Design a protein around this nucleic acid. Structure first.
Ligand SMILES: [Mg+2]
Ligand SMILES: [Zn+2]
Ligand SMILES: [Zn+2]
Ligand SMILES: [Zn+2]
Ligand SMILES: [Zn+2]
Ligand SMILES: [Zn+2]
Lengths: 131, 505
RNA sequence: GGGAUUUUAAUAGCUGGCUAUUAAAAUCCCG
């Protein structure tokens, strides 16, 4: 019964995230200590001629970015735990996330460690110019 | 990499996968979106939102090693080090039905303290906007073995209340024993899946009101506290887990427990399973392999009890040796052969199961040595024999008295933790059928430098008088004897004992 | 209903052999 979803290699860390008081610090400590990052993310095939905004309803990657499914790069969606956002809604799910090409080793860690700009809707430090 | 696990399984009945922007994993994407290079394409076909898919929680593995984070799935030796925190843990479950199929939810949680909690069937449901931990349709396990679980489907409570009840019960049990909690499970998979509902883990924390280790977590206060200050807390923080099946046991729990125990016979209930699990763990660690070199730190008054035991013994053995003119003594059970009292001039002989000194011989008592040891008094101090002979002084711990240093054990026995872990067999009153209870009395031969007693054996009381010296001595002996008796030790003597023989000295 | 081991079949891939996925069967444990 049912259909399998996740590899056995990731089950070591997500379980940890399912039990910790604060999951973001747990995942960042696991990755920074030398653990393997999350794999099995939904990476999309794009023409790479997008506007390069962080979160979009359609793939909008530039030549220096990669487009991922929104639910695949959210730690709370991968581990199936409660979101910390207002009203429990996910800001990634149902959308597409543009991750810089030099940070594709760990998209989940990039989404946890970074936030988009409130004005230009780009990643802060990776395209945002509001100075 | 390639091996797929049953954790986070999609237990929905839908025949198709999810959209690339909604699927959590590449495996869960529907195959219409995938391409040859392990990439998904964004087709123009509209998504099937909204949805609600039940996600399985079976398959947790807490084997990740992170610096600063403790190891919660502990091995055998450190579980023996943490024996005061042993709480048995069993969970009976209900299968998901109707909207879902392919996962189990907890239905009745049982603990070794004899407490059962019935919960509503609650699982994880993934929706287009996120996920929720709410109630799902469930069914009892089919079969005549689980007919008792059918009423429990209509008796559960909400999980947040049961969380606080569990934390309160654990705090009431483990307040004086330890700063930790060790869940002793038989099959740790479903037990860990159910423990995900009421346990939080992380770095080791200090209690917010004292210096003790924090064992409970409060989500509304976001605070950590020990067992004393965990009023209103809803989560168990950093519990230890022990799997008894991984210790080399073949078969089910019932046939393994019933092989060495006969006390915990009971109807099929999760608390009974947990009690049998903890009893089997106790048998595995303190009866199968004893004398493990582990010392346990003191808690309340064990040093004073150790002093008072010798204070009582040096009085009772001396009086027994003086009465009856017994000139030969066999101290069966003496590890080193050190005599109790050396003031009377009598012959001394020493025996033990594992003698530490060449002065002590090897001996085991099976009532066939009753005529063998018939020419002298027999000391049995903390010596466990199924039947004691007619000419003997006996001190035996009563396992029915439960204390901080006396944990429940196996087959009616008790784990006495006094700088060492000893498994004492169950106190049987028929073992002293040739013996009598030793009456209270004091003997003294010291010189002299309100009280009235008809049992004080002293030349002062023999003449019908008393002084401050013996009025204080008798009272400190009363304090020591009280402490020994209220601890749980019972003293027995040969049948013909009376203090009237002691006036000759 | 969940998991572990073994065996078989199909699919997919790689280099006579090997792995993975799915399905079926047997044994054992949990429910
Ligand atoms: Mg059970
Ligand atoms: Zn999310
Ligand atoms: Zn900006
Ligand atoms: Zn405290
Ligand atoms: Zn038992
Ligand atoms: Zn006197």
């Amino acid at each position: 019964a049912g259909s399998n979803t996740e590899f056995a290699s990731n089950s070591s860390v997500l379980s940890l995230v399912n039990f910790t008081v604060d999951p973001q610090k747990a995942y960042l400590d696991f990755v920074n200590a030398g653990g393997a990052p999350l794999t099995n993310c939904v990476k999309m095939l794009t023409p790479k001629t997008g506007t390069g905004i962080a979160i979009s309803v359609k793939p909008e990657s530039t030549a220096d970015q990669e487009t991922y499914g929104g639910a695949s790069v959210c730690l709370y969606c991968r581990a199936h735990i409660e979101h910390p956002d207002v009203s429990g809604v996910c800001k990634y799910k149902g959308k597409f996330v543009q991750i810089p090409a030099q940070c594709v080793r760990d998209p989940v860690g990039f989404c946890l460690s970074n936030t988009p700009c409130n004005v230009c809707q780009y990643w802060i430090g990776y395209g945002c110019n509001c100075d | 990499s390639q091996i797929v696990t049953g954790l986070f399984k999609d237990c929905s009945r839908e025949t198709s996968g999810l959209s690339p922007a909604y699927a959590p994993t590449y495996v869960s994407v529907d195959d219409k979106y995938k391409t040859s290079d392990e990439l998904c394409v964004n087709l123009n076909l509209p998504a099937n939102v909204p949805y609600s898919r039940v996600i399985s929680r079976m398959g947790f593995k807490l084997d990740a090693t992170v610096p600063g984070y403790p190891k919660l799935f502990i091995t055998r030796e450190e579980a023996v080090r943490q024996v005061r925190s042993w709480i048995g843990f069993d969970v009976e479950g209900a299968h998901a039905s109707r909207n879902a199929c392919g996962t189990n939810v907890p239905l009745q949680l049982g603990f070794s303290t004899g407490v059962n909690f019935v919960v509503q069937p609650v699982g994880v449901v993934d929706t287009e906007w996120g996920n929720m931990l709410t109630g799902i349709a469930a069914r009892p396990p089919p079969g005549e073995q689980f007919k008792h679980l059918v009423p429990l489907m209509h008796k559960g409570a909400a999980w947040p209340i049961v969380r606080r009840r569990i934390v309160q019960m654990l705090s009431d049990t483990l307040d004086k024993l330890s700063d930790y909690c060790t869940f002793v499970c038989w099959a740790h998979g479903f037990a860990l899946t159910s423990a995900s509902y009421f346990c939080k883990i992380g770095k080791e924390q200090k209690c917010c009101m004292c210096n003790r280790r924090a064992a409970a977590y409060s989500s509304p206060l976001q605070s950590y506290a020990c067992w004393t200050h965990s009023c209103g807390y809803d989560y168990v923080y950093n519990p230890f887990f022990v799997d008894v099946q991984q210790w080399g046991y073949v078969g089910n729990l019932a046939t393994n427990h019933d092989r060495y125990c006969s006390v915990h016979q009971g109807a099929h209930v999760a608390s009974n399973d947990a009690i049998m699990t903890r009893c089997l763990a106790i048998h595995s660690c303190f009866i199968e392999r004893v004398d493990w070199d582990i010392e346990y730190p003191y808690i309340s008054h064990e040093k004073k009890l150790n002093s008072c035991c010798r204070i009582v013994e040096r009085n009772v053995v001396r009086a027994a040796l003086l009465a009856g003119s017994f000139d030969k003594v066999y101290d069966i059970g003496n590890p080193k052969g050190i005599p109790i009292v050396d003031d009377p001039v009598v012959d001394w002989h020493y025996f033990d199961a594992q003698p530490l000194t060449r002065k002590v011989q090897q001996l085991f008592y099976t009532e066939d040595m009753a005529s063998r040891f018939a020419d002298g008094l027999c000391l049995f101090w903390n010596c466990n024999v199924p039947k004691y002979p007619n000419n003997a002084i006996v001190c035996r711990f009563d396992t029915r008295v439960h204390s901080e240093f006396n944990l429940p054990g196996c087959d009616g026995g008790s784990l006495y933790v006094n700088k060492h872990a000893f498994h004492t067999p169950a106190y049987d009153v028929s073992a002293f059928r040739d013996l009598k209870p030793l009456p209270f009395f004091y003997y003294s031969t010291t010189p002299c430098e309100p009280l009235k007693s008809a049992v004080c054996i002293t030349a002062c009381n023999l003449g019908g008088a008393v002084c401050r010296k013996h009025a204080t001595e008798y009272r400190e002996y009363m304090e020591a004897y009280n402490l020994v008796s209220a601890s749980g030790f019972r003293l027995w003597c040969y049948k013909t004992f009376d203090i009237y023989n002691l006036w000759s000295t």
